[PDB]
């Protein structure tokens, strides 16, 4: 019986009245003069630059003003970050990756300003993620956002109905079991975490091992507990991945192939990476599908920007 | 005629008195209580144990209360880590890596108390390096550290004559050509840019490509500028190497040789990687030679911590 196939747009679209709504009261106290998002583009690969134009016409659309900055060489790209920082028309700030592709990468995702920051690349975010921390501030007033990737893959899963809304808030992906194929600092080893503290058992992979994402078994700190399992070998893999019906996968290879052999009936399937990775016949065998998450994370660092906003006036006295 | 060798200890012996000072005063003022700094291994090397050793007796013999905390498995590093940010007693951190080697390093250098990172390990000392930045607050009193390595690396400089005194500060490095084997995030690129704006061309050497660090070319930003340069072929390497008359070395590789055959006459020779990389005949060839910084690199921490000391209490009230 084959599975259903959801695109990305449709599940950003459920956020779009939410969205336009925030985009409006803003104009309200803005004289009709909307949020403004500059976008770095600084590569030279035409798949970022169609997602470039995706968010750029998006946004625009949900009332923001997009601008979109496109630099020559990379080693100007900081530059330019740090003139936007101090630029108060500015209201949010995205960098598209990869720009050096590399360590770089990682360090100008902490250059950008943390209050402008729409993705939520700098570092706090990450760390409040791991330690399951709401607040920025101490009134607890100030939510911390998410990254958006991550917090998109999660956000699907809500669409889908795996997320079983009859248990409480922090425990509603009990007893479920998911499958990380990728383990970066960026959103393969947050996301792996993010889905553990909700509950589901995680088997995250990496090139190199296997681990085991589960609930924190600590009282010193709030943080998924991780256990560790043999050294990567392929047999091993299938195994995790029979077991866990929620497979998540986002490893930038475009030419990885991931065997339709390991998936199990009923299995949801996810990728986030620029590429297809799922070996196309996948259909026949997992429930749902969605072939990449792209839309949606657009419509992640939206509402992350409003939450910004509404933080930066919050916080504006 | 055969090049001299410098011991790192030889170089670090330099700053014993001036270390010493400092940490006398502060005991008076802590009644005879030395600093407390805290050093973190979680890794199964024994060359990391042996510096940790080293670390461990050199500073208790400075007044200074080293508290060597071992972690059996990696993952509760980290918690470890917060647990002595909140902690009062302890003065300072450090991290012996790698711990993960990869990503996960790059984030638990940003998790340590930003005013107790020893090393210079957070993202604030490396962007305040890379733009010029002196002072972190805005009366320019509290001094911003520079990440210990590649301050070290500058320090064995000074000691060794190269640097031209007679030339005002930040121009010192004028006249002179450098060449790093690394460019690596923590100590790699950081070191080159640092040398850069002191002066001197560097050309930066990395697994894939070659560049080439000046002086800014700019105005909106005061950071090295860097140029560009062909796809690293071996023999590039080898033009750069012999022009610039200073070659800084620090690949990870237990078995990577530099072609003696490179090095010019009166080259300064340096290596940082916690192995030898340059062909021991070496000697036949450099002006001056130091096999490692490692001695050097700890005194950098010291009188690091010392630093923020004052400007934890220079910024008590």
């Given amino acids: ?6 695109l990305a747009s449709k599940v950003a679209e459920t956020f779009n009245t939410e969205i336009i709504n925030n985009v409006e009261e803003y104009k309200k106290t803005h004289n009709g003069q909307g949020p403004l998002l500059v976008g770095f583009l600084a590569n030279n690969d035409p798949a970022a630059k169609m997602y470039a134009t995706w968010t750029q016409k998006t946004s625009e659309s949900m009332g ?58 700098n570092h706090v975010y990450y760390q409040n993620l791991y330690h399951n921390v709401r607040y920025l501030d101490k009134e607890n007033r100030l939510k911390s956002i998410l990254p958006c990737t991550p917090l998109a893959i999660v956000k699907i899963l809500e669409f889908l109905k795996i997320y079983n809304n009859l248990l409480p808030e922090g425990n509603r992906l009990y007893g479920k079991k998911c499958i990380v194929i990728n383990r970066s600092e960026i959103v393969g080893r947050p996301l792996a975490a993010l889905l553990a503290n909700d509950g589901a058992t995680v088997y995250s992979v990496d090139v190199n091992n296997i681990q085991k994402f589960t609930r924190g078994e600590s009282l010193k700190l709030n943080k998924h507990h991780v256990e560790d399992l043999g050294e990567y070998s392929e047999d091993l893999l299938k195994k995790c991945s029979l077991d866990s019906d929620v ?51 657009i419509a992640m660092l939206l509402r992350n920007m409003l939450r910004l906003v509404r933080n930066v006036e919050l916080s504006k006295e």
């Fill in 247 to 297: 497979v998540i996968t986002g490893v930038p290879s475009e030419n990885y192939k991931f065997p339709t052999e390991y998936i199990k009936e009923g299995a949801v399937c996810i990728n986030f990476a620029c590429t297809k990775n799922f070996s196309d016949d996948v259909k026949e065998k997992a429930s749902l599908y969605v072939p990449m998450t792209g839309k949606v994370t």
């Fill in 64 to 121: 923001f003003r997009y601008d979109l900055r496109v630099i020559e060489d990379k080693d100007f790209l900081e530059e330019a970050i740090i003139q936007a920082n101090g630029d108060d028309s500015v209201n949010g700030i995205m960098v598209y990756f990869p720009v050096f592709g590399n360590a770089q990468d990682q360090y100008l995702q902490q250059v950008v300003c943390k209050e402008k920051d729409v993705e939520g690349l």
């Fill in 1 to 6: 019986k084959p599975g259903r196939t959801i």
